Write a protein that binds this DNA or RNA. Sequence first.
RNA 1: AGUACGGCCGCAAGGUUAAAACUCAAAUGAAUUGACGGGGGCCCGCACAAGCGGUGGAGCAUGUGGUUUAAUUCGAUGCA
Lengths: 151, 76, 77, 65, 116
Amino acid sequence: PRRRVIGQRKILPDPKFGSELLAKFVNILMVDGKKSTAESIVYSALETLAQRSGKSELEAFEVALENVRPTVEVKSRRVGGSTYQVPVEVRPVRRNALAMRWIVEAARKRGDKSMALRLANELSDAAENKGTAVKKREDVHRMAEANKAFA
Amino acid sequence: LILDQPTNDLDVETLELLEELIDSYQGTVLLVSHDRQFVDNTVTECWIFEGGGKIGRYVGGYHDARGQQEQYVALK
Amino acid sequence: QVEEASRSGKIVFEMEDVCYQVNGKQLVKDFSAQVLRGDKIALIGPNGCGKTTLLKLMLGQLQADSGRIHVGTKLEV
Amino acid sequence: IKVRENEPFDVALRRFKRSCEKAGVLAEVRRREFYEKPTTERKRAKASAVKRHAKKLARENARRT
Amino acid sequence: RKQVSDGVAHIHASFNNTIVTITDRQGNALGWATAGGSGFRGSRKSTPFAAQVAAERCADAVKEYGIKNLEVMVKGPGPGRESTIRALNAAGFRITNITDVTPIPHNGCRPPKKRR
RNA sequence: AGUACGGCCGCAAGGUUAAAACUCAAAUGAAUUGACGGGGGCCCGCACAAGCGGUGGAGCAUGUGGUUUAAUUCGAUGCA
Ligand SMILES: Nc1ncnc2c1ncn2[C@@H]1O[C@H](COP(=O)(O)OP(=O)(O)OP(=O)(O)O)[C@@H](O)[C@H]1O
Ligand SMILES: [Mg+2]
Ligand SMILES: [Mg+2]
Ligand SMILES: [Mg+2]
Ligand SMILES: [Mg+2]
Ligand SMILES: [Mg+2]
Ligand SMILES: [Mg+2]
Ligand SMILES: [Mg+2]
Ligand SMILES: [Mg+2]
Ligand SMILES: [Mg+2]
């Protein structure tokens, strides 16, 4: 994308809840283009989060997400032979793109049982600032502060 | 490996090697220790004990796990 | 130097619904956790809170009051 | 160089050092010598300046903008 | 101790480091802080943010004297040339007059050779 | 080869004067069209960056190299 600029691509909303937020989350963990299966998993994983939390469907999905989305993240920015990295603030629309990713990646580890179960554990951990997904944020959050000299 | 305070009487020179040995160990390791510096170089998770038979499992070394334990909100 | 052996089963310890309590106070109340291969775990807490007895449950030294514990399959403890 | 700053200022804005003493003065003193690369520099550093007067006089052209 | 009212801030900004030292009127030091000692060992200490933290720490460890009024004397061209003096303002010091005391010979001693 | 020998000069470093045999069919100067630069501007593109999924390990299918064989027919050998 040197000359080009790209506006956006439209996404179908989630069927139970007319929110585009839960619609992209289904896409991220969907593999081999199997949208039905990944949609079942998210529904079998957020059904329990209503049971545990008290918040029902999206305030419960938001609250777990909100403790995982970052504020800054770094990149390699060599100048003329340098090799260091520069912390750069991230736009509000890439936050959820990174936040959902980290949850699903950490869910594929920690193998307990069916994905609908081990994802349910990871989502509930992020509702408490407890799981791996939060640690991945703080690991980035430290490295962005340890290199704060570059800005 | 199960270690109930493996570094009680060891000096730091011998303890330094044990930190490197246990770190590189490929297999499973469950270790118990009451000091701070030693668990920041060998372990990546904690099972922090609480009263009433409740165990809270946090992620990271000692200091990282205690960090999540300040910010706990316990899923209202 | 350590003596590495063949890789253990992917599940080392699995215990769910396990709740063991000494006469007076509860040491472990409705535990549910898993220990996978190559996972390094540190038990920490206060004095006399059951760290040494928790390992005893894992190796089957003393029997859990309830909940059942399943052990790994190619372990060399 | 010195700024008394008077009573109300609330902000530095010390561009007063840019006149006179600054890293511009010290750069020539950081190192070097050679006693005649200055005469290579000062000959180049003004041969170019007059060559810009030729290009500045080269505005007598349509150039159609 | 000695509850000195008015002091002077010396900043030795350099191409590699920046050393902040707070003194009274008559050249008696009271405390200091550098970029390197503030956890910036390596190539990071040559950046104005590291210079900010050096004056952040030097604002402390001098508060025992309760230094309210401050003069600033800046020496040497380097990154942390204005970052340190903005840090002292946010540290709560009143600044009266800023100075430049960079030493420039009138063609005195011979500098080093050159680096190729 | 600004070298050898010989003069003159110098404390020395060395300076000045100054060859020949031999060997090559060229050496050289300025400019032209290209190519090339770890030279400079402007523009690009799955080239990086942001991502998804693989190869390299395992078993098998197919082709090649080598080695064997009475013959393992011939051809294709960086990108291509
Ligand atoms: N043989 C025993 N008979 C009775 N009570 C026991 C016995 N062994 C341990 N206990 C009790 O069980 C509880 C846990 O003991 P345990 O040995 O597991 O402690 P711990 O958590 O490892 O602590 P510490 O770090 O102090 O050794 C304590 O209340 C202790 O008094
Ligand atoms: Mg030098
Ligand atoms: Mg001669
Ligand atoms: Mg000569
Ligand atoms: Mg001679
Ligand atoms: Mg890439
Ligand atoms: Mg293979
Ligand atoms: Mg042929
Ligand atoms: Mg062939
Ligand atoms: Mg042929």
